[PDB]
Structure formats: C-alpha cells, structure tokens
C-alpha cells in the first residue's frame, strides 16, 4: 500500500507559489462560508510517521486559513478528568461545533497504533479499536461531519536521511487498510517534499470542503406483561428498606472505586419515573448522584452531533448519573413526532448499542429501565393529577398529544427492545400500576446489577 | 453572635410533622415555579461546626424537594483542570443555570476558615478571601442569583456530647473556627444575600428552619470628559516596508523564545483584542499565530452570547474559556463588550455596565493573581481611514470581506465609542492589566507594537517571579 507514497512526490518552487495564492483565498472562502452555513463540522485528523511534516504542515494551514475558525487539540497527556472516563469521552469532550474545524493530533489512531507497537495490546484488541474507529467515524459523518484524515509518510531510507518504524507502517498498513472508507478517506501524503506534502492537504482540504458545503406491530412484548402484579403494607415496606439499605451498602462498598454507574428511565407519561427515582435517592446522600433530566437540546447541544449532549454527562469512577428520559428519545418522542428522519433513528440503535458497549468496557454498570403502565391507569392517574390544586401535577397540551399516540409509542418500545436490550445492557421492564412494586423492582435491578459487576471482577 | 443559636431551639414531633406535610408540598410548588421561569439560579452554601447536621439537612431537602432539580456539589478535592486554573474557575464552572438549584459544600468559605484554622494563610489573606467573597457574592446577586448561606451551629459544649479535614476533637480548632466564623459572616451578611445560623442540636428544628428560610425566600423571588486619551493619539505614525519585516521577524522570534522558556510554566497569557470596525484585529493576531505552533494557543472569537451562557451570568461566558497554565489564550472582542456595544445598543441596562467596570477589574486581579499574564489592546483608527477599508474590502471580489448591513450604522454612533473606549480606559486600566492603545491606521506599525507588548509583558512577568 504504502508505496504509492515512496515514489518521490515533488512540486517546484515556482509552481507551488502560484498554487498557494489562489489555494489560500479559496481556502478563506470556503471557511468563511462554513461559518455562515453553520451545518457540519470539520475534523481533520493528523497521523503518519514522526518528521514527515505533520506539525509544519498544520502550521501552514493556520497561516492559509484563518485560526479563529480553527481548534488544534493533541491527546498525548490525559487528564484525571479524562482518566477516569471511557476513553472516547475525551474526544466528545473536544469535538467542534458546527461550523467550525477541529485538527486532532494525539487521536485514537495514534493510541490503538502505539499500544500495538509498544505491546500493551494483543492483536484481536487492535482489531476490535479498528472496528470501533470504524462505526464511530461512520456516527460522526452520519451526523453530518466532514472527516479527512492524513498520514505523513516517509520511507525507511528516506526517514533515516533526515540527520520502531517497522512494525509501525505494519500496523499502520492494516488498520489504514480496514478504516479507508468512501465517507471518509485515508490520504496518504508523501511528506518528503514539504512543497507537494502541504499544497497536497491543502488542495483535498478545499476539494472535500467545497464539494461539502454545494449540498441539501411490534406489542408483543408489553403485551406479555403482568400488571397485576403489586407489594403489599408490609412487603412494601420491608423490601423498601432491604433494597434502601442494600444500595448504600453497595456504593459505599471499595469495589465501586473500579465501576460507576448509569441508570435510564423511561416510560409511559404518569407512569412514576420521578417517585421510582427518589426512592433510589432516598438511599444515598446528594453527594453520592448527579440526577440529568433530559429535555429538548440546547443550542450548544444542537451544534454537536446527537449522542454529545449524553457523553457530556457521563460519570467519573464511583460516581452515578440518573437520565430522567435519555438517547432513547431518539427512537421514541423524535421517531413518533419527526424531530428527526427516518434513517436517523434507524441508525440510533446500533449507534446506541456501540455507546452503551463503551461505557460497560470501561466499568460503567448500565441499568434501563421502562415503566409500563395500561393506557386505563394512565387516564386514571391524568385525572387524579387534575384535580390536585398543584400546577406541577397539571396535564400539559402535550401530554395529551402523546397519550393520543399511545399506540406509536408501544411499537416503538418494542422495536427498541428488540434491537437494544442486549446481554452487555438489557431493558428492564417495571410494572407500574402498582408504585410500589415498581419502586422495589427498580432499587433490586440496580443493587443485583452492581453485584453482578463485583462477582464479574472476580 | 453566635450566642443567639446557643439557646437550645426544639420542635416537638408532632408539630413538625404537621408543619413538614405543607412545607414540602410548598417546596415542591415553588420548585416548579422556579423551573417554568427559568429566569434566575438558586445557589445555598452549606457551612458550619462539624456534627451540626449540614449532610444530614441537605439530604432531607432532597427527599422534600426534586432532586432531578438541585445539583449538590462539594469542592475539595480539586480535578488537575480545576488547580491549573484560578481558584475561582471551578466554582464557575458549576453555577447551576437559571430554574435550577444548586447546593455547595466546601465552598469558599470552608476553603478560607479551614486555611486560616490550619495556618496554611495569614490574617492579611483571610481579609482579603473575605473581600474577593463579598464581591463575588454581590456580582451573582446583581446578576439575579437568589443566594442562601446557612451557618449550622453547635456550641462548644454541644459539640463536645456529639469526612472533615480538621480534627474537631481539639478544643483549639472549635475556638478558632468559631472565631474566624464570625469574622466571615459578619463581613458578608448582606441584605441581599443574609447569613442564616440555624441551631442544628434538634434536627427537627434545623430542617424546618432552613426549610422554612428557603421558601419564604424563593416565594418572594418568584414574586418580583474621557476622550482626550484617544483624541491626543498620534495617528499618524507607521513602519515601512523593511523596518517592518525585520522588526515584525524579530519579534515573532522573541515571542517564540519567551513561550518556549521554561518560566512559562509557571504562567498562562491572556491577549484581549478590541477595536473600532475594519480597525485590522484579524490581521494582528495572526501574525501573533504566526510565531507560534498551533497546539501552543487558543483563539475564541467572541459573540452574541448562545443558550448555555444566557442562563449563565455574565462573567461565566468567558471564565469556561481562561488558559491553565503554560497555554495562551487569545479574546478576539471579550468580556469588555458590556461597557462597549452592549452600553451603546442597550442590550444591558446602566446599572448593568456601570458596575462592570469594578467586575471586570476583580476578574482580571483573580487572573493576575494566578499567574496570568493579561494584556489588553484597544486598536485605533480614524474615521476616515474606517471607510478607506470598508471600500477595500467591498473592493475585492471576496466574500468574507463585504461590509455588512449593521456597522454602516455603528459608524454614526462613532463619538458614542469614543466616550466608552475613553471611560472604559480610565476605569480598568490598572497597574495589573494596563490598556494598550495601538495606532492602527497602519497596519504594520499596529502589528509590530502588539507583538512588542506581548513580549514586554511576558518579560515583565519573569522579573517579577523569583
């Protein structure tokens, strides 16, 4: 493959001059119209071997272009803040908005390629981060990002001329071979030539910049459900206080140090979400959680692509975040409602499957839960909450307009635990018409899950 | 003072469960409330003698209340992010947005009295922890927080029948907390922002107390000539062609050096760039760029504020973007825009702006204080030199540069910059953060003397360090 690229690459000094005035203002243009258009991001990643021009010529696209449009990051040097969180999240962490360019030194190619040639990671764990680079760069430009990626190459004799490498193009070879895709191309730059190697980036820079901005039943599941099911006085509130007790117990154990822990809540409208969460926080002291009730996304949020706004939120070890409603508003309200299209949501379940196989790699302990009640004791419930004398208990326009779409909203949660309770995240469907049982059914999943995990790490 | 909350308040059982059915069905509502306005933030700070409840309060406050609605944080255990910024950041950085609650433990004040207790500062730097409080405190408050502080106390004796950093069971370290507590909260009870000290020996005394506090004070919240520095510019000065590539060369190459020095380390820089419309503030900081690798610097151009900052207060805009150390941040427009287009369109109110001035003055003492090296430029040009480049630019076919529909007008409101750029010099240009005025009608004399300020700057700043 690489040799391509060994060929001798060169461009002449009056040509590249010329070149580079026009490439510059065309360039500027571009960018300029990026920011206006303010519909996708720029992400250009810089790989390759050491000296083949990758810093100089990340320099020179900053003189060309113009700096205020563009953030350099390098992920040589983690934080704790970093450290302590699945290592994707600090990529998220630094992705541009729309609009905007972000140049990533230090990437995840850069990890996986050095962790492989260093021998901290066998070959079937490179194989997996290959095949991880894949589905979230397919993510990024399926949410609408313009991906270039770069590597600056020299060869063996043309390096050592310059005043590990071997197993590094071998690796290289491989994962360049399984992540060049027609979405997002692997260029392989001759860097010997400082000329041809800038004018070269420069030029599909502008190519794929230009070309970028000129463009425009399923009820089984619920229905098998016993509702019926209810704790008495007495089982109530003695399997309360058990699981109460039992969740301290399990937090304050030293083996949450190694794990932390998400919890998901979604269900019917009345269906007690906000009772079966502060049962679980009636366990803990406030200091223990960070409680994120998700609404309609904010502007910042709106200019990253879709699971950014979840990822930002995502807790450090010994740390647990409860989403009050989640990413799974994706393939539910944004599905039955047209917030998104189609082939957005289609999407959303593996691109969820592959977020939550994440957090669970790193330690993360997921529990989801559905509160399901019958559309009768939904009515019920929307009439009591009327005539408290309580705005909060007030049922909202919308509430209604959901309730209407009841329907929609039971094939859509059956299609999202076909394609998303899986053995390393499965859905937990909570009978809700009797609270309680559904109070001590969420506080036992949680606390079975996190000694689950403990048994898991031996 | 604490005397008062020596007394021994009690409340019986059956009284405060009564009171407590109506209490956080009240709560609840007001949350709520609070929540549809979204119109300010809720900050309580929780302080006081170990063993007086503080934890305990909190979370009952959070079995009465939402807790979907109320973020709870403590800080003392600082993240490497935190330290390598000010020490003001990392409480900026979790200033719960309006409609929200947010509860602080280890706040500044425990930061300050456990210091002072420990010996770890002197009474001079306890002075001044107070101070930078009250001030910080007063912005919040101005801004629109509805700010809590509740001192839970015990007594000596109380305590003495009764995971903190102090040891407690040293009679010492009661007497000098306590001492230094009523240092604090007598010089930062404010009318608009009261200590509260709540008697915490009855647990359902101090609950309903403070829960009872927080309603009342949330149903009620509910319910509601300086252009002689710029006219004796001289204008007219420039660099020719040579001069300019040789000085420009060498100075590009001192920065580069200075950034490189090992000293840096123990430094951060702020570049802050303001000027009139077409006054070349792209084309200064790029050559500043241009001296330095990419990794080396960040460029935030500043605008209308997004969704996320406008539920924030002001100064939150720009705290989430200053430099840890040994990086360089670079404020194309910055937070003097209230006291500039802000003050001339009346996008904020007088008070708004009058009181920036000290504000932005504290911000950048807490900068300098950390090590950050502030520099601050204002390019100036004439007005007829203005128009000379808004044709330029329409000139060229490019369309980045066509002279758009807003700053024909900003230019009839030219005298009206000419009195804030003069008021804004006068009243922050300090010993700390100096303004510089750049001539700027020439554009290479302008960048020349920009690059030069810099690195005078941070030459200044190694002869001050050890």
Known sequence: ????????????????????????????????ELKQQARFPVIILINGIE??????????????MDPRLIEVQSFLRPSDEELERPPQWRFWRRLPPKGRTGIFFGNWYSQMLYAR????????????????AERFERMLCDEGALLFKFWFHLS???????????????????????????????????????RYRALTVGR???????AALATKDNRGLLDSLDLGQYLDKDAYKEQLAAEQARLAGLIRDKRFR???????????????????????????????????????????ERAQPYLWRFWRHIPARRQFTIFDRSWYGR??????????????????????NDFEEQLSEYGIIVVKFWLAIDKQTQMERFKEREKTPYKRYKITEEDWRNRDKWDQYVDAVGDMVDRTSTEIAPWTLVEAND????????????????????KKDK
């Open 1 to 32: 493959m690489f040799e391509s690229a060994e060929v001798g690459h060169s461009i002449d000094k009056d040509t590249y001059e010329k070149a580079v005035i026009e490439l510059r203002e065309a360039l500027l243009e571009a960018q300029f």
């Open 51 to 64: 000296g083949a021009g990758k810093g100089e010529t990340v320099k020179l696209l900053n003189e060309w």
């Open 117 to 132: 040639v260093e021998g901290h990671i066998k070959e079937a764990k490179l194989d997996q981060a290959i095949d991880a």
């Open 156 to 194: 063996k004799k043309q390096l050592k001329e310059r005043l590990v490498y071997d197993r590094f193009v071998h690796y290289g070879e491989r994962v360049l071979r399984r992540t060049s895709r027609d979405y997002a191309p692997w260029y392989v730059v001759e860097g010997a030539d400082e």
């Open 204 to 210: 599909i820079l502008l190519e794929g910049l230009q």
């Open 258 to 300: 190694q794990h932390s822990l998400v919890a998901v809540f979604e269900g019917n409208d009345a269906a007690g979400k906000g009772g079966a969460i502060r049962r679980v926080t009636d366990a803990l002291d406030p200091r223990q959680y960070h409680i994120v009730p998700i609404a309609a996304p904010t502007e910042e």
């Open 331 to 352: 393939v539910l309200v944004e599905r039955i409602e047209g917030f998104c299209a189609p082939a957005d949501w289609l999407r959303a379940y593996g691109e969820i």
């Open 435 to 454: 609270k309680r049982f559904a109070r001590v059914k969420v506080l036992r999943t949680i606390n079975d899950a996190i000694e689950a995990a403990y």
